[PDB]
Design a protein around this ligand. Structure first.
Ligand code: 4LU
Ligand code: 4LU
Ligand code: K
Ligand code: K
Ligand code: K
Ligand code: K
Ligand code: MN
Ligand code: MN
Lengths: 496, 496
């Protein structure tokens, strides 16, 4: 099976790329595996595969850390991500996000049911497992639990059967047969939970699949529209129907080659302690436990030699930056274009801890609108900040065509030099806020509302007659023939 | 003579450091010298010494580009700057700025007059030179003139003789015996000019010295207080009285080892076209010429084999970032401490195009103030933004003790995660603005007023009971003994 369609094959691909380190000596799931992975993410090193976990048994489990993190070279920086999607390892971010958006203008390709797959090679019923005995990692020293779920996909379906959602949301072990986790608005797992809670008759049938097809975990991390079944989006994206097998204890369907599958229920009534957790913005507040959603686990199925992927998330750079930020930016680009806004590109700068999105504007199109900064900021912010795709994003930065939004140095340069504080900005207090950002949930104002801004880094003439400056840089302040002469004589002269 | 006291010796030091490239083949002052220098600054390469300028004659002049720019290695990043100050080349930015501040609590050491020096080796009277025939560079393709003055020191004295100021301000050739340049409030050259203009009797006696003692050009770039003679500050800083020789045509005094000296007058009545110029924020607006101050040149004196230093300024990183930003930050640190504010460190992040200063707060001291964000922002912004030291700075970012303000990644992380837009900020519209920033002089509002902000990236408990988080990073989220084990086994395991 190809890498993008089978996690086991993806691990192979990473080896074969010289993008993996296999670690066959014992590694402790209590902090050591995550510490090594954290170091990898902070240095853009090779992904670690821990083949010898302490306390590995019933054959559960090996760990792959840093599955969606960065490579060291500029040329294949995003190669791990490219390998989720059948793209060349030199793919740019534009090409990755275009791939992720491509299915938004295609018919879904619904999944194919098959009778069995590798995820059925082993099973443990509810007298045979104990989640507290498995080698579940402690990821950060102050975490409030062992976070089994950092890179699996939750599967829940609307009561009417018409929407099956796949998404990533964190969860930790509560006791031998339960998890607790985040289930928060406006996320689709929360929207579906609310439908079951309003019907009032039963807990939500649920599955959590770990080590799913890479192309599926990428869609699981993307805010595709309400009501859209990720399986059919991924089918369209990849050009192929995904093969799914039915759960044994419910009627949900899981990828056939899933490494590990939990089957059970998400309660419509019960909660339990959840968190704290070292999170995407780089923080943990020790002791900050709150009531989260509760999950019952009835059955585990798994591949021979199962591998659990793990995100050791926090400070730059990991899956919470490369996937959450970039995939939200992608969806925001599309949303703006569908609202008739002249946005060509969007990206969440890593330097902003993926709390900003830079929007590149087609300024010929903007000029034809015959508008102003105040009006345009206002229009962009209403579209984005009132939509789920904008949930995680607190600052939008509008930039003209000269800026490469995929280059954070250029975004920072534009923001710092073209946006006058206050006057060139519009604050939005009456929109949903992302409480996970420290300045929101641990800050001076409402945790769930406001704190958003549109910062216009378009210069005045970009709305009227066109750009009226040149950069004071090598590229723009010298003619072509001089530039080339300099470059041709560079090493001759003594330079590197 | 030591490097910090004699520019010729500084050039030697750079060679000897393997921090110079000598270029002995002909180089055109029309754009080529500046293009090579621009490339150096954008790549942190070795400083270029152009020993064979096209149109070099009456022995005027060689050029040294990038005199205060960055080196490639992290370990001696600031080494060129250290070599201005007798500091080791591995000096940190803290150590450089402390050196620059050290004289603020010392008696001045006034300069010593000597009868002659190297700057008298050659002379041209006002029938012998022509500024349009010298190899003055065109620095950026769209500049409005050939900017002779990018790294020399203007010397002007108050009418009463009690204050002699040394400062860098740009100037370009107007005609055979005149320059035009920036002379703008609140700068000291402007304050002194105003005193002469109010007296109304004569033009300002003036000299412009190029290739001055390195320690002197650093003080020339720093906003030391009103009324303080830079020569005596530099004397105190260096522990030695500077040797000065009298001008031939006026009673000003110039460093004895100056490479090139212009003597003349700064008009109290006449102006001439000035600019545009590719500037510190990275821009040029072609065609944007305005009336600037006018200077008459009566005499040139110069060293044998004179060397003109040149800043090819623009996008990161050059003297306008390393010196303007950092030296303003230094003075702001001191100003805050003298106003009883608990600021330990200040730096202007390069990533902000030196338009921000990050202020590190001693949060034990802040807690004892028993104050709030609104009040503290307000107090900091009034102190800084109403003072000349704050002129160039439009955003102050307050951070707690865990942040290294000399590390722009950490400043950005703190700003993006700890400062809620709007609520955690105070805008300042009724303060002097820096018109050179594009969003000011070419923006939507008043060019000279407002556009400033204090952004509080202190978290709430930093005002009350103390920091309540740990970072989700390798350093903070894992115990010491684990961290060391990981590091000790890193290359063993397969990592770099
Ligand atoms: C890549 C990724 C995405 C996480 C995520 C993580 C990763 C690695 C973790 C597990 C390491 C840390 C926490 N995560 C959560 C999360 N969304 C959320 O609601 N709760 C979370 O706990 N997300 C974001 C979420 O997957 C996206 O917002 C999706 O758009 C949700 O899918 P949906 O649009 O179908 O609701
Ligand atoms: C290092 C440096 C500093 C420049 C400077 C440049 C460099 C290389 C140039 C020449 C390349 C570009 C323009 N510069 C100007 C300038 N200040 C100003 O008033 N006009 C300028 O044209 N400065 C900043 C100025 O030197 C500081 O604000 C000093 O504090 C001024 O001294 P003062 O406090 O005695 O007035
Ligand atoms: K999803
Ligand atoms: K603007
Ligand atoms: K000065
Ligand atoms: K704050
Ligand atoms: Mn969804
Ligand atoms: Mn001064």
């Amino acid at each position: 099976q190809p890498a993008h369609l089978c996690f086991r094959s993806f691990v192979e691909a990473l080896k074969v790329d010289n993008d993996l380190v296999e670690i066959n000596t014992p590694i402790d799931p209590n902090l050591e595996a995550a510490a090594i992975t954290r170091r990898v993410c902070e240095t853009n090193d090779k992904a670690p595969l821990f083949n010898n976990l302490i306390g590995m048994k019933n054959g559960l489990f090996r760990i792959l850390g840093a599955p969606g993190s960065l490579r060291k070279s500029s040329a294949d920086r995003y190669g791990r991500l490219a390998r989720h999607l059948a793209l060349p390892p030199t793919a740019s971010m534009r090409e990755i996000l275009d791939k992720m958006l491509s299915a938004s203008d295609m018919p879904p390709i619904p999944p194919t049911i098959v009778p069995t797959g590798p995820c059925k090679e082993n099973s443990l019923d509810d007298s045979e497992f104990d989640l507290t005995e498995l080698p579940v990692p402690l990821i950060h020293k102050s975490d409030g639990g062992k976070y089994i779920q950092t890179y699996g996909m939750h599967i829940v379906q609307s009561p009417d059967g018409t929407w099956t959602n796949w998404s990533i949301a964190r969860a930790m072990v509560h006791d031998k047969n339960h998890l607790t986790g985040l289930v928060i608005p406006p996320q689709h797992i929360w929207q579906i939970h609310q439908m079951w809670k309003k019907e009032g008759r039963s807990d939500v049938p649920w599955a959590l699949a770990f080590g799913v097809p890479p192309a599926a975990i990428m869609a699981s991390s993307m805010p595709i529209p309400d009501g859209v079944t990720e399986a059919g989006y991924v089918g369209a994206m990849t050009g192929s129907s995904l093969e799914l097998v039915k759960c044994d204890t419910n009627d949900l369907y899981v990828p056939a080659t899933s490494e590990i599958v939990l089957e059970g229920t998400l309660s419509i009534s019960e909660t339990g302690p959840e968190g704290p957790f070292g999170q995407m913005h780089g923080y943990i507040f020790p002791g900050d436990t709150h009531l989260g959603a509760k999950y019952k686990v009835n059955r585990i199925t798994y591949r021979n030699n199962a591998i659990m992927p793990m995100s050791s998330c926090g400070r730059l750079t990991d899956e919470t930056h490369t996937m959450i930020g970039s995939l939200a930016a992608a969806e925001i680009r599309k949303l703006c274009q569908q609202n008739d806004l002249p946005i060509t590109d969007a990206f969440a700068p890593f330097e902003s801890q993926v709390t900003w999105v830079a929007l590149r504007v087609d300024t010929e199109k903007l000029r034809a609108m015959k508008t102003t900064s105040e009006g345009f900021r206002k229009r962009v912010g209403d579209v984005v900040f009132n939509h789920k795709a904008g949930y995680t994003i607190h600052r939008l930065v509008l930039v003209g065509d000269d800026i490469d939004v995929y280059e954070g140095k250029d975004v920072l340069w534009a923001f710092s030099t073209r946006c006058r504080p206050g006057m060139d900005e519009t604050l939005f207090e009456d929109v949903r806020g992302f409480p996970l950002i420290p300045y929101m949930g641990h800050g001076n104002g409402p945790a769930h509302r406001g704190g958003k801004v549109v910062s216009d880094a378009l210069m005045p003439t970009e709305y009227t007659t066109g750009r009226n400056w040149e950069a004071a840089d090598f590229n723009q302040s010298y003619p072509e023939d001089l530039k080339q002469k300099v470059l041709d004589n560079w090493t001759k002269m003594g330079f590197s």
